[PDB]
Amino acid sequence: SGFRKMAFPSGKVEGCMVQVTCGTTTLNGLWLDDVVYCPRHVICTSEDMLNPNYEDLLIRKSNHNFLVQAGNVQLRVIGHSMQNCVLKLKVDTANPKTPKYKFVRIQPGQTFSVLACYNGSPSGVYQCAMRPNFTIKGSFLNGSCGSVGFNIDYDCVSFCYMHHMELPTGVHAGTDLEGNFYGPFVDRQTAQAAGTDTTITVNVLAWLYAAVINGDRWFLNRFTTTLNDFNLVAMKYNYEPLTQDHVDILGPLSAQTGIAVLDMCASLKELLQNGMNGRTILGSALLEDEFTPFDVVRQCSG
Amino acid sequence: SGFRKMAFPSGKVEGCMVQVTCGTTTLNGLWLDDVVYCPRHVINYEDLLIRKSNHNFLVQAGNVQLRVIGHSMQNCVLKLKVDTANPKTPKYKFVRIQPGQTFSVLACYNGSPSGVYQCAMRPNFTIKGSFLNGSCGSVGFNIDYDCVSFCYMHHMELPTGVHAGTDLEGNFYGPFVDRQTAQAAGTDTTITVNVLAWLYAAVINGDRWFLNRFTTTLNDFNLVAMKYNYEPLTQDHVDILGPLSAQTGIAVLDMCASLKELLQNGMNGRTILGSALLEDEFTPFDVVRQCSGVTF
Ligand SMILES: O=C(Cc1cc(Cl)cc(N2CCN(C(=O)c3ccco3)CC2)c1)Nc1cncc2ccccc12
Ligand SMILES: O=C(Cc1cc(Cl)cc(N2CCN(C(=O)c3ccco3)CC2)c1)Nc1cncc2ccccc12
Ligand SMILES: [Cl-]
């Protein structure tokens, strides 16, 4: 019993964190096999904030300009290349602690663990979700760039995010491990605004199923809804549209609890209308949207 | 910016988790040096233990079976001596924590780490954990520099879905016993010093709507705290929050006046750090560590 915002154990990623220094800038790098991955903005000077030409800045660098530190050992950079917004520093030593891993690009609503790092050293681990506006609500200070987001399945680490920047609203933007930004963001200090964020409806429904599995039913009602009427209502509270894919995805939790998806949708519509009336659901007075259907099944069933 | 429920990096503890099987029961063990610690309920415990041989305890560390060469009990923990010291043993201490203190839990099943989450020792000595059958022996810890302070070992789940366990010396937190008998968690209260720390975290992150011009006395605040099932705030708590008070410019009794108003009037549709409830599972130290980026 119980339901917590649970992160993956971070050890497999901790053994990959290194410090990358280029000039006056120091940030984190991810050392997998003989490559260190990090944000390409590590090559920017104070004059390359707004409109850096990374190809031009990179061509001027030598391998010995990149100082890479793995624990108390300086690694030797023997090559460098850029892939989209990530810099790949070839090193002369393969990381002996390289886990089984994959690079995966995630979709909005997906969750992942973040291992926040400073100076190549892990500081903490927390659970995140890719918001519908492609930002993440992380906890990051200056120096956290290059910290990564990941999931673990079996003994395989799926790296899905690399931290690049904080937007004016305190939310965070980054890329996958192929250097492609999530969202319409660029690794320039030109003014960029996150689009209006919305609630991840499918995740709220998953969390209501988690509540039912854990013994709570107070929010259930005798009603159902059509998918279209639900979306018309949900949109008025800035909830993401619920698609037939989301309904299908909720099938297993529906079968386990005996509450049809559209019946849970009617419960959600009522909660949006009434609020909680001093009650909580799984220790929260707000509807939680950073647990996916897959997270609920994993945490509640194994 | 941002403020998350953040756990310590778990790698140092992951390299200590092993599976312990005794008869039909399988649970987790903590392998430090040449000893595996686990709940004694894996087995009148003295009478049940005397009947066991070393080979009855099957200990698996990854894909390797360890050899048990001795067994002894310390309070509610069983100590299985093994023939091999754990090469991954970190620098560690066993520490007993107090209610209100937080720690990270590395939830494990079959000796394999499944997740990590941060929680607090409730004033009623339970933890609002997230555990399924097979999670016994999972541990709670804090990290200071490179030293792991192990403070909790999971033993059981109470009827309300909350959890009970011991320190690593086998002493239960709370008035619980390791017997398959209905036991109830006492009425819980809110960890006041932690709520104040989290309000300071909100101020540091730009959430100031709940601030007010008022201050209060420690005694008047505690009278209001008692009324709302909040733990008493001591002068030690006030002193502990001193750094956050100096950083934000909000004296602890000034934050207490903000807290009193929140308790008597509610949030009025507003939130603080993304919560519509007052969060009490961040200590003043947690706030300073997170809002300053300390590493391990
Ligand atoms: O965010 C950067 C550095 C950084 C990298 C890159 Cl690739 C881009 C940019 N920009 C992003 C977009 N932009 C704006 O939209 C803006 C701010 C004010 C008005 O407009 C300007 C800066 C900033 N670092 C840091 C990463 N994470 C947490 C930090 C918490 C404190 C301080 C820094 C942190
Ligand atoms: O709680 C035990 C096993 C266990 C160990 C020991 Cl030392 C004692 C006891 N009991 C004494 C405490 N008690 C109650 O007060 C209670 C619950 C329901 C009715 O009464 C439960 C029986 C149970 N395991 C598990 C650990 N964590 C999560 C689990 C989630 C599902 C199932 C089991 C889990
Ligand atoms: Cl995805």
DSSP for B15-56, please give it.
TTEEEEEETTEEEEEEEETTEEEEEGGG--HHHHHHT--GGG
Q: What is the resolution of this structure in A?
A: 1.6
Q: Is B157 in the pocket of ligand 2 (CB under 6 A)?
A: yes
Tell me the chain A residues in contact with residue B276 when contact means C-beta distances shorter than 8 Å. 284-286
Could you tell me if A278 and A284 are in contact, meaning their C-beta atoms sit under 8 angstroms apart? no
Q: Do A283 and B129 touch (CB under 8 A)?
A: no
Place of tokens 């300073």: B288
- Interatomic CA distance for residues B183 and B179, integer angstroms: 9
Chosen for mutation from A3, A8, A10, A117 (greatest number of chain B CBs closer than 10 Å) is: A10
Spell A266-285 as b/e; 16+ CB within 10 A means b: bbbbbbbeeeeeeeebeebb
Question: Is B76 labeled as catalytic in the residue annotation?
Answer: no
**Do B293 and A9 count as a contact with CB atoms less than 8 A apart?**
no
Name the DSSP class of A64.
G
User: What are residue B117's DSSP bridge partners?
Assistant: B105
Sheet holding A73-75, edge to edge: A73-75, A66-70, A17-22, A25-32, A35-39, A86-91, A77-83
Contact A144, B293 (CB under 8 A): yes
**Contact assignment for A280 to B277 by CB distance below 8 Å:** yes
Tokens of A53: 């030409």
The token pair at B98 is 């107090």
Nearest Cα to Cα of residue B266 among B280, B256, B277: B277
Q: Tokens for A155, please give them.
A: 């003994």
Distance from CA of A11 to the nearest CA of B (A): 3
Q: Domains, chain A, ranges and CATH?
A: 1-14+100-197 (2.40.10.10), 15-99 (2.40.10.10), 198-301 (1.10.1840.10)
Q: Do B296 and A215 touch (CB under 8 A)?
A: no
Nearest to A285 among B3, B109, B277 (CB): B277
Q: Are A261 and A293 in contact (CB under 8 A)?
A: no
**Smallest Cα–Cα separation from A68: which of A141, A120, A118?**
A120
A60: distance to nearest CA of chain B, Å? 33
Q: How far is the CA of A212 from the centre of ligand 1 (A)?
A: 41
Of all ligands present, the nearest one to the C-alpha of A111 is 3
CA dist A170 and B206 (Å) reads 10
A171: which chain B residues are within 8 Å (Cβ-Cβ)?
2
Residue of B6, B131, B135 best to disrupt the A interface, most CBs of A under 10 A: B6
Contact (CB<8Å) A126/B5: yes
Q: Which of A9, A128, A300 sits opposite B106 (nearest CB)?
A: A9
Task: Please say whether the beta carbons of B253 and B221 come within 8 A.
Answer: yes
**Residue B159 beta carbon below 6 angstroms from any ligand 2 atom:** yes
Residue nearest to atom 30 of ligand 1 (CA): A141
How far is residue A221's CA from residue A268's CA, in Å, rounded to a whole number? Answer: 10
DSSP B195-242: HHHHHHHHHHTT--TT--S----HHHHHHHHHHTTBPPPPHHHHHHTH
Query: Would you call A1 and B131 a contact, using CB atoms and an 8 Å cutoff?
Result: yes
Residue A280 CA to residue A276 CA, distance in Å, equals 7
A145 catalytic, yes or no?
A: yes
Q: Which residues, listed in sequence order, are joined to residue B139 by a DSSP beta bridge? A: B106, B153
**Secondary structure class of B58 (helix, strand, coil):** strand
Question: Which of the listed residues B156, B163, B172, B176 should we mutate to test ligand 2's pocket, taking the one with most ligand atoms within 8 A of CB?
Answer: B156
Distance between CA atoms of residues B154 and B108, nearest Å? 10
Technique employed here was: X-ray
| Residue among B38, B41, B119, B237 flagged as catalytic | B41
Helix/strand/coil percent split, chain B, to 5: 25, 30, 45
Best mutation site among B8, B10, B271 for testing chain A: the one with the most A CBs within 10 Å?
B10
**Is the alpha carbon torsion for A18, A22, A26, A29 positive or negative?**
negative
Radius of gyration of chain B (CA): 21
Which residues does chain B have within 8 Å of residue A301's beta carbon, measured at their own beta carbons? 132
Question: How far A95 CA sits from the closest chain B CA (Å)?
Answer: 16
- The Cα A298–Cα A276 span in angstroms is 27
> Each residue of A138-157: b (16+ CB within 10 Å) or e?
bbbeebbbbbbbbbbeeeeb
Task: Please indicate whether residue A167, judged by its CB atom, sits closer than 6 Å to ligand 1.
Answer: yes
Per-residue buried b or exposed e for A74-88, using 16+ beta carbons within 10 Å of the residue's own CB: ebebeebeeeebbbb
Q: Work out the minimum CA distance from B221 to partner chain A, whole angstroms.
A: 23
CA distances from B145 to A118, A143, A163, A225, A294 (A): 14, 19, 24, 54, 35
Residue B188: Cβ within 10 Å count = 17
- Unique residue bearing structure tokens 């549709």: B269
Closest atom of ligand 1 to CA, residue A187: 7
Place of tokens 């001027």: A60
B162/B230 Cα distance (integer angstroms): 19
Written as one letter, the residue type at B123 is P
Nearest to A125 among B109, B116, B119 (CB): B116
* Span from the CA of A193 to the centroid of ligand 1 (angstroms): 11
Cβ-in-10-Å burial (0-12, 13-18, 19+) of B126 comes to buried
Q: Is A167 left (phi over 0), alpha (psi -120 to 50) or beta?
A: beta
User: From CA B120, how far away is CA B127, in angstroms rounded?
Assistant: 6
Q: Which residues does chain B have within 8 Å of residue A116's beta carbon, measured at their own beta carbons?
A: 6, 293
